[PDB]
Amino acid sequence: HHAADYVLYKDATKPVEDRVADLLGRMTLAEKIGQMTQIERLVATPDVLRDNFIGSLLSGGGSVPRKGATAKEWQDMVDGFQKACMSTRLGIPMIYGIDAVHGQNNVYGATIFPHNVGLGATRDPYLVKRIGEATALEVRATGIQYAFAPCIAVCRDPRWGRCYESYSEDRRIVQSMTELIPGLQGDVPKDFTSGMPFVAGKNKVAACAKHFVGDGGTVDGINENNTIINREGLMNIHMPAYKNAMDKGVSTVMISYSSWNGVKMHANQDLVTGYLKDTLKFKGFVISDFEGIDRITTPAGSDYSYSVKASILAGLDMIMVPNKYQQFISILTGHVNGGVIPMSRIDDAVTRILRVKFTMGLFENPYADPAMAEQLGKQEHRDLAREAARKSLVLLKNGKTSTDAPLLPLPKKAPKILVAGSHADNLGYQCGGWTIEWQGDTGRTTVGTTILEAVKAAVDPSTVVVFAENPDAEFVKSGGFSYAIVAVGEHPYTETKGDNLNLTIPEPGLSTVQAVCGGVRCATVLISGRPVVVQPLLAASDALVAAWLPGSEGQGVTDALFGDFGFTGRLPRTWFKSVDQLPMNVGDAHYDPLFRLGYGLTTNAT
Ligand SMILES: CO[C@@H]1O[C@H](CS[C@@H]2O[C@H](CO)[C@@H](O)[C@H](O)[C@H]2O)[C@@H](O)[C@H](O)[C@H]1O
Prior knowledge:
Elements: H1 16-24, H2 29-35, E1 37-40, H3 46-51, E2 56-59, H4 71-86, E3 95-98, H5 116-122, H6 125-140, E4 146-147, H7 171-176, H8 180-185, E5 208-212, E6 226-227, H9 231-238, H10 240-247, E7 252-255, E8 259-260, E9 263-264, H11 269-277, E10 285-287, H12 304-314, E11 319-320, H13 325-337, H14 343-359, H15 379-392, E12 394-398, E13 416-420, H16 427-431, H17 451-458, E14 464-468, H18 473-478, E15 484-489, H19 510-517, E16 522-527, H20 535-540, E17 543-548, H21 555-561, E18 575-576, E19 593-595
Parallel strand pairs: 1-2, 1-11, 2-3, 3-4, 5-7, 6-8, 7-10, 13-14, 13-15, 15-16, 16-17
Antiparallel strand pairs: 8-9, 12-17, 18-19
Helix pairs in contact: 1-14, 5-15, 6-15, 12-13, 15-21, 17-21
Bound molecules: a molecule of 2 linked components (U1Y-BGC).
């Protein structure tokens, strides 16, 4: 189609399938294997990217150009890597991925949305689609084109350190919240074929349904462990939302560290190829988890040759190496040169990678848009996060007896009020894991509004607000307080660090609640990734709210405390009476909850 030096795959007007086929047919084996290779920015240089024809880069959790980097800094980093990739013989742009799982959460100044369990509590799939839209904008503000989200794990045991990354123990809720996908990627066209990848263009990102499959079903909630369940249960609980994701054009699927009945997912041809590819008709690319192939073996990494063989034959398309690229590339090249892995399997992997890249517009817009930088932390997106935080809150108690005056909503005008607790003025604690650092952090780690700041911003000018982190009982009783707001709960955690068999909050937390509530009427705000042992906290408190991990916009919490909006959240998980009950999910035969799934008290706006 005209010009003497015309190359079909570089023609934007051509159908994606024709561009993929035209490009594939030109590639060397080294070029093909390079597309299948994703490396950490920590090991990337221009020469590495060029010499090894690398297909993708990622930032893992906390992998940043520097602490406090601006949006432009991120764009410059990503474009530097892109220029190197575009300088190869074939000029195939890399795709850059990141965990933007509650906003663009590694980035300083990014809006931090509530974690998934609180989103589950909202029962509001359109809110979650809007959050996807806003997240895509803030990811593209940093030049990144690919988010490792949503986690559609169905967490069946809150002892799991990733339970907060699951919208619910009820697959139907998880299914509903697959609306994240068209928020991130754009809505699919009317004609769309389920399982095809889709991204609308340069203001959207590729998504990733993760972690396939049964990551939420592991024995005793042990992260990365074995999900012991028959096929019927895997298909009825852990699988459904993947089909919703196909329907919505999810571009990629990331495989789980976990096993299913003792078979590593990263080596499970029947499920990756037989089921996802051949039965759900997924036509995007399948990515490993981080050193996922290494972990096929015990010890991990003890037979990398086998790891490469087993994962690639199972049907994985792109390997998140992410550091030992030369070992990966060499081993895979050897397996193809030896006939162990057929060229058909390489060609399938590369077709799928390229299909996503061309579909998303990455050949047409391989570089960042400077005008998008101001999307980062944009006030409209904070307003959305504040809405989401407020909707996520579940009111568990609002009065010690049935005849007490309800404590919430609180008056904004009172002579003096107390705000207390470890979690009242700690932004990192309110955001939880996957915020700035992999495992989250403590203190003022980003731009946001703590619960204390929110209270000060809400109350009448005549209202004196006193903060005490851990006041003793005498301080409370002598203070002349009208009421207290006391916030306590879990410290930030992620993945195996958060696996927890006792589910009791750290001290001082209960002791602070008891000291405060013993002296003045109190509303307790519980910050957690999951249900935790809560009867002691309830017994002390006039009112108690499960605020989950609400993110950067602490005014969402005060919007409900002070009655600007009513409480509407409902539990998206069972609240257990004791951890000896676990696992215990809605619908089980022996179901004896403290609070059932769907529980939540309400208030009316004042
Ligand atoms: C301890 O090493 C750290 O692990 C984290 C999480 S592992 C894995 O990482 C993927 C890519 O970031 C996620 O999409 C996935 O959900 C995770 O299970 C990794 O992020 C750090 O880069 C690594 O240092």
